[PDB]
Every structure is written in C-alpha cells, then in structure tokens.
C-alpha cells in the first residue's frame, strides 16, 4: 500500500516504475503527497525536455504553498500527465497510479543503480 513492492525510489520522495519499453514513470510518494496537502495545480515540464538529476522541472501547487518537484534521474522527458490539469487531486488520491507526473527516458545507468528500492525507501521514512 504506502510503498509498493515493485517500485524504485528517490529522495526527493519520488518513485519510478520501469515500463515495458524501458522508459520510467515518475510521480511522488504517498509520504510526499501527505506532506504537500491537497494539490490544486501542477506545472509540468515540456515533452522533449532534457533534464539532469536534481533539476527542478515541475511545480505542485497546494492551497498552502508552491513546491518544486525534482528530476530523480538524468534523461529526456517523453511524456507528462495531462490528466493533472483537470484532476490535480490524483497526486493525493492515487500517487502511484493516476497521480503520476512524468515519464523519462533515462540517459545514465549508474544513477538508476543507486535509486532506493521498496525496502531502502521504507527505511527513509522510518529513519526519521
């Protein structure tokens, strides 16, 4: 539930799911969304944008504040969640499903190789 088994994780508090075509679907974790509160807008990057790990490339707006969402890995943005324009509350209700933010074609295997796993992640919320 709170941390699905099959996912990779950043810190950041983002998740990544490897798609069948080798790209990664990225969104924020239940813990990230809980800390955000109800999302009212999200500003998505441009499809075709190149990012480096650590770039701020999307913004979630809640009732209380704006907050940056950072690239978990280096790569090219291949898709963005256009459902979030009408239904931004999907980040809150379905952070691992309907609430995904973007998709990335990763350009660097070593970054991928240091992403946290369901276990290393549950150790990070639990750590503090």
């Amino acid at each position: 539930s709170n941390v699905p088994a099959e996912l990779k994780y950043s810190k950041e508090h983002e998740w990544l799911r490897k798609e069948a075509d080798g790209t990664y679907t990225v969104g924020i974790t239940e813990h990230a969304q809980e800390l955000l509160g109800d999302m009212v807008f999200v500003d998505l990057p441009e499809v075709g944008a190149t990012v480096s790990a650590g770039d701020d490339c999307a913004v979630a707006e809640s009732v209380k504040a704006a907050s940056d969402i950072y690239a978990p890995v280096s790569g090219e943005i291949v898709a963005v969640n256009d459902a979030l324009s009408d239904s931004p509350e999907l980040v809150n209700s379905e952070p691992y499903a309907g609430g995904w933010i973007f998709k990335i074609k990763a350009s660097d295997e070593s970054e991928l190789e240091s992403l946290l796993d369901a276990t290393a992640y549950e150790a990070l919320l639990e750590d503090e």
């Binding site: 509160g37 009212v40 500003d43 707006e61 009732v63 704006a66 809150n92």
Partner: protein, 363 residues
C-alpha cells in the same frame, strides 16, 4: 506550544497538528479541500478553544464598552444580542476585532483572537479599571464552532429539551447560556451554525458526540479558505495597529451615530475619514496560479500613472475554483490590476471584498 483539552480527540480523528501561535492545532484531518466542502454543503466543526473569552460585570459595563469599542453596544437591546466590532488604539489603528454579547445590563461577554490575547487583556484591564468592572478570563471554557447548512440541525441532536427550547428560532448573532452550554449563532465561515462554549472537562465528549452526529472535523486550512471567501478579516493581515479600520473594510462597523459617544480612536478616525484612506478590495485571478500574502498589486490610472497596493490575504477558493485575495490598495483603483508572481505579471479582476455569500459565488 500549548494544546487544547481536545488534543487527543484531534489525533483520534486523524489531525495533522501544527504549531499555531503557541498552540498545537489541526491544520487538517486529511484534506483541507474536503473540509471546506463539508462546511459549504453540510456540517464541519473547528476547535476554537484557543480564542480568549472575557466576561465583564458591573453597573458600568455598558458605559465602559461604549467607550472601549468603535461599534456601539447600545445597539444590543435584546437579551443575548451580539455584534462584531473593532477595538482601536488612540491613533485609530486596530488593536483587535472581536464579538461582544449582551446578557444583562450588567453582564457582557467578549470573544477575542488567540494571537492577540495578552495585548487585548492588558488593554482591557487597563481601561476597565476606572469603571470598576469585574473582569473574568474564562480559560475554564473550550469552544467548538459548528458550521454549515446542516450544522445547527446536527448540533441540536446533542441538546436536551431546555437547550432546544432556548435556541428555537434563534436569529444570527445571538448567544444564550443554556445549562453548561453557551450557544451562539456566530461563526467565521459565511454559513449558518453555532459556536458552543462549555467546560474544558466536557469538551472531548461533546466533540466525540458531534463527530458521531455527522459533523466533519475541519482544521485551520479550511478555516482560512472559508473565512477568506466570506470576506472576513484576519487580524494581523487585513488590519493591525497601523491600519485604520476604514482601510480594512470595517467602515461599516463604526457606529458614528449618536455623535456624542466618544470611543478610543474616534477623534483620529474622524480625521482619517476627512483625509481619506486606502481601501480593502477583493482580487480574483482566473488564470492558473495562486495569489499569496504580501504580493504587490499594481494598476495604472487613466493618466498613465502607476500605483501600488499589497495583498493582505491570498488563497485558492475551492468554492470558486480560482485563486482569490484581499488587498489593501489606493483609492481610484479600477476593474483590473496586475499582481507580481515569481517574476511575471498576472492580470487580476478587482472586486468587492467578498466572494461567496449565502451559499454561492457572488460573481
């Protein structure tokens, strides 16, 4: 940071606590937008126990309050009648806004903000003294605000027969003691409902029974978006000791008549009314984004001259589906303005300082 007697009930209801002016209070219980929706469509409730309640007794009470306050308690002529008022300093700035309830010629009650408790108590005990008023700080009481179109019906399922009798037919802005409940038709959301004050030791259980009656727990998040939609001020943002009420859309609360009632600040106010003041307006931003506190608001008069006000409160309105704000602006503003967000200039519509009235967008 302190806490209310309800701290436990809040966490049992899933509250996310934050520090609010030295009290741990619920920001929300899961979703502020849902909490806001509940108040607008059904029944929601807020722990308002951190507000200070002051009882004032003695034959000089009415006289004293006619001097302390800028509205005029002589308007209160029916048992239990309440009004809203500012309490000004000698320069006509606002020390606090508050609600006063009239009980008997010799018994009134004030309810003031939490952030302003110490300053107000000192101001009140300072000026009351020569009137010989018996001043009681009611920290022995908690208070729950129950708000929404079914709030009064849900709350009343907890009232015994005498309490139901006491409140039946009760119009807006009245308060009544009925046994150990004080029930008042006051609120900060723009909806009908009650505020109920009762002993601290009974408050946990009343909250529990209210939950069980179908009233949704609502936190500070929703408290802010409801009050802002309703056009209601938040002390420290819409006004403070440097801001005149007539610049904070509280002109309507100043009881100028009878002219022979002097009150603290009246003389300075009279002078300000004559020199003119800035004014509080509503901002509506239909384009994507959210207006935030203290952002500059700019407009250009017919002549090509730029002028600048400030946002006092900004939020997203879940009832409008758009960001709204209150802002203090020079006179002569027109229909539109521009607000600086990040480093881009966002058009806004300028409106009356109220967004939702008797249920709907007042568009």
């Amino acid at each position: 940071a302190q806490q209310t007697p309800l701290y436990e009930q809040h966490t049992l209801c899933g509250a996310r606590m934050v520090d609010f002016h030295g009290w741990m209070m619920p920001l929300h219980y899961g979703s502020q937008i849902d909490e806001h929706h509940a108040v607008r469509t059904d029944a929601g409730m807020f722990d308002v126990s951190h507000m200070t309640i002051v009882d004032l007794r003695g034959s000089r009470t009415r006289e004293f309050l006619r001097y302390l306050l800028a509205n005029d308690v002589a308007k209160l002529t029916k048992s239990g009648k309440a009004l809203y008022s500012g309490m000004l300093n000698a320069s006509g700035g606002v020390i606090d806004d508050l609600i006063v309830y009239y009980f008997t010629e010799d018994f009134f009650r004030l309810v003031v903000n939490s952030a302003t408790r110490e300053k107000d108590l000192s101001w009140i005990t300072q000026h009351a003294e020569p009137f010989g008023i018996e001043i009681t700080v009611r920290d022995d009481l908690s208070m729950i605000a129950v708000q929404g179109p079914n709030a009064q019906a849900k709350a009343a399922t907890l009232f015994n027969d005498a309490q139901r009798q006491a409140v039946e037919g009760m119009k807006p802005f009245f308060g009544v003691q009925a046994g150990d409940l004080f029930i008042a038709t006051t609120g900060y959301t723009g909806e009908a409902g009650y505020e109920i004050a009762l002993p601290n030791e009974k408050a946990a259980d009343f909250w529990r029974a209210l939950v069980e009656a179908g009233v949704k727990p609502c936190g500070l998040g929703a408290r802010d978006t409801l009050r802002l939609e309703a056009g209601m001020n938040l002390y420290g943002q819409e006004m403070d000791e440097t801001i005149s009420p007539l610049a904070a859309n509280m002109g309507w609360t100043i009881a100028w008549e009878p002219a022979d009632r002097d009150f603290i600040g009246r003389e300075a106010l009279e002078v300000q009314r004559e020199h003119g003041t800035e004014k509080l307006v509503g901002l509506v931003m239909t384009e994507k984004g959210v207006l935030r506190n203290e952002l500059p608001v700019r407009f250009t008069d017919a002549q090509g001259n730029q002028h600048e006000g400030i946002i006092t409160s900004g939020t997203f309105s879940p009832t409008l589906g758009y960001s709204i704000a209150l802002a203090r602006v020079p006179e002569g503003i027109g229909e539109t303005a521009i607000v600086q967000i990040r480093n881009r200039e966002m058009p806004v519509k300028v409106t009356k300082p109220v967004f939702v009235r008797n249920g709907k967008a007042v568009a």
